């Protein structure tokens, strides 16, 4: 696999064991070879997982999720997904790695989207070799792939918000549940029913992930809610899956504003990666797997693809040249290489405002192209009277760095800004001027 000018799909069934087994060989092999490589895990729970496989190994860990005194004798990097990305389109020169290694590639995250894409550019050109790790790879049409042990897959009706009767089967179980929701929002409903019902249970989404994953580990839990992160490499110790089988789907309208469509179908990667949390260990057959609705393409005009090429647009690869979408994955938008590119300075700007502004790809890229300073808060109040954000059915409303108080109005809509509590509270100090 580690020949140059080749992309390999590691497609192992899940639980298979690619992470424990299969890539400490790969990296003994590359060390052997003298190939400067790289290791990209999805998210910081992954990396401390992968560092208990390569215990041992010389492995550079760029990651605070790891305790380690490094030995200066490393030619194998480990980073997660958005650090690859942050790295290339900030002024730092990340190497030219000869082997590129992405586990969980089927993450649909727009900094994972545009690291497939640099990295199968550069095997094209006949640079560097890459593996790509997952089960389910871009167009898969199998939503109930093989595992370790017979699961019962059983077609049902999964309540989405509270209920009184209709659904024994949910509170009669004894074991332990991983139930997947839309939405934190609709998430927060079903698990203040199950609470008042009696049981224990944890939430689970992209901000609180790390901290909210250790209590499966330290405290005793009857269910786990959770939204489509835990579907990149999450390991539980459960016999149940209940999936909704819906997703929010983020929509440019007119190319002015932003939306969150939905509740609609996952991808038969999504509902194959949801079933394979169970089934995992081949002693404890009979896990269950309950689906509420049927798959979908419904990652075609997802606005992920739209700003993965933002990205790509913005990072240097060869004089004028830009990165291409990894193939099987560039039908998905409607956009000519190369229209996203801003100049120096607007450039600094876009990257500040993702970075340190923490605000979503296409909302940094609308304030940057307009010629907008990073500090310049002006634009979160002039907008039109349709784009007003509410809080609580009543107009939000913040001090300026003026210190005046104005109502929320931003001349660009992006919806993702107040799609729950946590992020209205961070968009209003950004309007604020509090970072
Ligand atoms: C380590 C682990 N992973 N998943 C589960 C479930 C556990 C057990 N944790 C409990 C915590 C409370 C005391 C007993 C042990």
């Given at each position: ?6 992309l ?42 992968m ?9 550079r ?13 490393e030619?194998?990097?480990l980073?997660?997904?958005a ?17 590129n290694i ?40 199998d939503a ?9 897959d ?11 009767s ?52 330290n ?33 440019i309208?007119?190319g ?8 609609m ?16 260990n081949?002693?404890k ?17 997802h ?6 090429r ?19 994955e ?17 450039r ?11 605000l979503?790809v ?6 940057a ?20 954000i ?5 107009p ?5 760095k ?18 729950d ?15």
């Open positions: 696999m580690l020949k140059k000018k080749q390999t799909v590691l497609d192992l069934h899940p639980g298979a064991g690619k992470t424990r087994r299969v890539l400490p060989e790969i990296v003994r092999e590359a060390i052997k070879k003298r190939l400067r490589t790289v290791i990209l895990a999805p998210t910081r729970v992954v990396a401390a997982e560092e208990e496989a390569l215990r041992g190994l010389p492995v860990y760029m990651t605070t999720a790891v305790n380690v005194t490094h030995s200066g004798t030619i194998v990097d980073m997660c997904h650090t690859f990305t942050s790295r290339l389109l900030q002024p730092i020169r990340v190497p030219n790695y000869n082997l992405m586990d969980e590639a089927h993450f649909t995250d727009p900094s994972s989207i545009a690291a497939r894409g640099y990295i199968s550019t550069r095997v094209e050109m006949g640079e560097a070799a890459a593996i790509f790790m997952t089960a389910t790879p871009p167009g898969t049409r109930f792939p093989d595992s370790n042990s017979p699961i019962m059983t077609e049902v009706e999964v309540p989405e918000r509270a209920w009184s209709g659904f024994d089967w949910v509170t009669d179980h004894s074991g332990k549940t991983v139930w997947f929701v839309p939405s934190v929002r609709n998430g927060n409903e079903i698990a203040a029913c199950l609470t008042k019902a009696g049981k224990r249970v944890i939430q689970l989404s992209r901000k609180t992930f790390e901290t909210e994953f250790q209590k499966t580990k405290q005793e839990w009857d269910f786990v809610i959770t939204t489509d992160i835990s579907e990149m490499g999450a390991n539980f110790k459960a016999d149940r899956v209940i999936d909704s089988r819906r997703c929010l789907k983020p929509v309208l007119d002015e504003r932003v939306i969150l469509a939905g509740p179908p996952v991808t038969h990667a999504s509902a194959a990666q949801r079933r394979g949390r169970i089934g995992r081949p002693n057959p009979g896990d269950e797997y309950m689906y509420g609705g049927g798959c979908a393409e419904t990652d075609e005009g606005a992920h693809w739209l700003e993965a933002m990205l790509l647009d913005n990072i240097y690869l060869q004089d004028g040249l830009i990165a291409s979408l990894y193939r099987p560039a039908d998905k938008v409607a956009a000519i290489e190369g229209e996203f590119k801003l100049r120096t300075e607007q600094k700007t876009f990257v500040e405002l993702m970075k340190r502004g923490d979503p296409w909302l940094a890229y609308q304030v192209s307009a010629g907008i300073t990073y500090t310049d808060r002006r634009w979160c109040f002039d907008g039109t009277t349709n784009n007003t509410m809080e609580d059915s009543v939000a409303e913040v001090w300026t003026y210190g005046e108080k104005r109502v929320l109005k931003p001349r660009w809509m992006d919806a993702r800004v107040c799609s509590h946590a992020a209205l509270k961070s968009f209003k100090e950004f309007a604020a001027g509090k970072r």
